[PDB]
């Protein structure tokens, strides 16, 4: 359970980030793609995509990185109550895009990564770790949801 320091903590910079969330999805899913490379394989959408140029130019790949990032920021602004927003999530992710826990844990190291660049005087260490501790919390309650219909692994 994250106390309310640290969802303040998480909630401050998340702020940030809604001033160009087009700019940080691209960010975030070229950083995904690059560093873990059987993530791209996933989406029939994306993976006629071969270099980071090509990524950028993207404008669907800039589109569906809003559409990852606002429901994010609708499961952040929960604080943990966020039942209703990650049933459909994880049932659409397990069953349907068949996406492994691990490729949440490396999406997961992406968001961190590009909120540290974009935004450090408001992602220092207390952030950092209280925003791992959110994104922690939103692994953990789709794991269960994943183990739940037979897919954690
Ligand atoms: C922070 C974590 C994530 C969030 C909030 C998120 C959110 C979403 C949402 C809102 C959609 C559209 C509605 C739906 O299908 O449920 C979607 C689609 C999808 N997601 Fe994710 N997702 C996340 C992580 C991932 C990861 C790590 C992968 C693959 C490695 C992935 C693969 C997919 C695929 C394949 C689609 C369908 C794209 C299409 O063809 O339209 N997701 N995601």
């Known amino acids: 359970v994250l106390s309310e320091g640290e969802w303040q903590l998480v909630l401050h910079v998340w702020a940030k980030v809604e001033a160009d969330v087009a700019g940080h999805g691209q960010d975030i ?49 929960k604080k943990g109550h966020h039942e209703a927003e990650l049933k459909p999530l994880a049932q659409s992710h397990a069953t349907k895009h068949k996406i492994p826990i691990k490729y949440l844990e490396f999406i997961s190291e992406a968001i961190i990564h590009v909120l540290h660049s974009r935004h450090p005087g408001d992602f220092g260490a207390d952030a950092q770790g209280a925003m791992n501790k959110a994104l922690e919390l939103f692994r953990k309650d789709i794991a269960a949801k994943y183990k739940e219909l037979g897919y954690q692994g």
Not at 30 to 51: A, G, V
Not at 71 to 76: E, F, H, P, S, T
Request: hydrophobic fraction near 40%; glycine fraction near 4%; avoid cysteine.
């Open 29 to 77: 899913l070229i950083r995904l793609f690059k560093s873990h490379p059987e993530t791209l394989e996933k989406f029939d959408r994306f993976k006629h995509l071969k270099t980071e140029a090509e990524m950028k130019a993207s404008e669907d790949l800039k589109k569906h990185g809003v559409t990852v990032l606002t429901a994010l920021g609708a499961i952040l602004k």
